[PDB]
Amino acid sequence: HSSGLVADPVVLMETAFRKAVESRQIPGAVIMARDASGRLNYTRCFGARTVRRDENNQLPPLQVDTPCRLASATKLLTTIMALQCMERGLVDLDETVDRLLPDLSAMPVLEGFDDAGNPRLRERRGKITLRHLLTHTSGLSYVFLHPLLREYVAQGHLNRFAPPLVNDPGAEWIYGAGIDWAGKLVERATGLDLEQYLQENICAPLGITDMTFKLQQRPDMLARRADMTHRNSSDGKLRYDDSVYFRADGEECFGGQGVFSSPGSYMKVLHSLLKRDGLLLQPETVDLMFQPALEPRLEEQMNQHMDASPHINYGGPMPMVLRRSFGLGGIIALEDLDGENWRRKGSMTFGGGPNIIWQIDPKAGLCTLVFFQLEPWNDPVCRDLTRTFEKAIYAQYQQG
């Protein structure tokens, strides 16, 4: 036409999400991207927050303000809370946790079992520090992940705080309860429960009114929450899952998994970190979070473990084989994911069990999130849709 007078990657990506909902591959999704400047403010919602039909045989929509189970996306929130304690001089990242976590310090290491089935417990060697807790290098694991803890529970010997360690601090990178113990350290250092601490130090500075460990105390959030959806392994179909986490909060605030919030409120956290606006942490402390924390020996072992474990895939949509490290808050990419087309070296990421993925990319000046409420973790459809979203957004952002 006439200037001034009266195949898109992003449009194609949005169509892909819409088709995934229409074909019942996913219940719905929320995708968000923000840049440091504020110029990029992209939010899109697709489909439903459940597969359970309401009284009118309708599926309630999944929205930017829908309360969701964050699962392991809670770990970044707890990391920030522990780092605020450090900034306020309540804890040193390299001092022993003995002073605030004598109960964790008293925990033995489970070595194995004797030929009669009796557990073989020994004393932990070396100090556990808050830096070990935040980097998953304390020797703490998870019952569902470790074969020794799996055997220890199956025999009837045992709550994220209860299991013995499986290694000494600094021996190896092991995904586990270290963030739950970092949350407990925050409570001990401040004299507040993690819920009150979260409200005063993460929520209030960002104007967040829907982020809590105590969902049962929020009937407004209960009325609007997503339900969990499960993909059946037998036929790949979507089913309603009555998640125990949506029924009761429990007494303990589990820093590694327990927060419920909306995608919109979670993006406020990511965006504050990307902008280094000082609302949650000093800019120097945010820079520290993105620094590779592992010595060469642990970096090599973590990479060998992850490259060999695509069935676990902590990295979610990141390439299966990549040079990574771990910072304070998530996995750091030590190389560009795909040259100038996608996440850059230095970007940090983590996920939540229901296929939630967050990433902050300081070099590119972008942060993105994808929320699903679909289990199990590492779902191929969610993975592919997340890669498609990120790649389309990076393309549009760089084009100008």
Curated annotation (Swiss-Prot):
Q: What use does biotechnology make of this protein?
A: Lovastatin acts as a hypolipidemic agent that works as inhibitor of (3S)-hydroxymethylglutaryl-coenzyme A (HMG-CoA) reductase (HMGR) which reduces HMG-CoA to mevalonate and is the key step in cholesterol biosynthesis. Lovastatin, simvastatin and related compounds are widely used to treat hypercholesteremia and reduce the risk of cardiovascular disease. Furthermore, statins such as lovastatin were found to be anticancer agents.
Question: Binding positions for 2-methylbutanoate?
Answer: G353
> Is-annotated flag, keyword Acyltransferase?
yes
Cite the active-site annotation.
Answer: S72 (acyl-ester intermediate)
This protein's record includes keyword Acyltransferase: yes
> Which pathway does UniProt place it in?
Polyketide biosynthesis; lovastatin biosynthesis
Q: Which GO terms describe its biological process?
A: antibiotic biosynthetic process; defense response to fungus; lovastatin biosynthetic process; polyketide biosynthetic process
Reaction(s) this enzyme catalyzes, per UniProt: monacolin J carboxylate + (S)-2-methylbutanoyl-[2-methylbutanoate polyketide synthase] = lovastatin carboxylate + holo-[2-methylbutanoate polyketide synthase]
- Effect after changing S72 to A/N: Abolishes enzyme activity
**What does the UniProt record report as the effect of altering D92R in this chain?**
Strongly increases simvastatin synthase activity upon overexpression in E.coli and abolishes activity with LovD-bound alpha-methylbutanoate
Consequence of substituting H157Y:
Strongly increases simvastatin synthase activity upon overexpression in E.coli
Any GO molecular function:
acyltransferase activity
State the protein's purpose.
Answer: Monacolin J acid methylbutanoyltransferase; part of the gene cluster that mediates the biosynthesis of lovastatin (also known as mevinolin, mevacor or monacolin K), a hypolipidemic inhibitor of (3S)-hydroxymethylglutaryl-coenzyme A (HMG-CoA) reductase (HMGR). The first step in the biosynthesis of lovastatin is the production of dihydromonacolin L acid by the lovastatin nonaketide synthase lovB and the trans-acting enoyl reductase lovC via condensation of one acetyl-CoA unit and 8 malonyl-CoA units. Dihydromonacolin L acid is released from lovB by the thioesterase lovG.
The record's similarity note reads: Belongs to the class-A beta-lactamase family.
Indicate what this protein is called per its UniProt record.
Monacolin J acid methylbutanoyltransferase
Q: Which organism is it from?
A: Aspergillus terreus
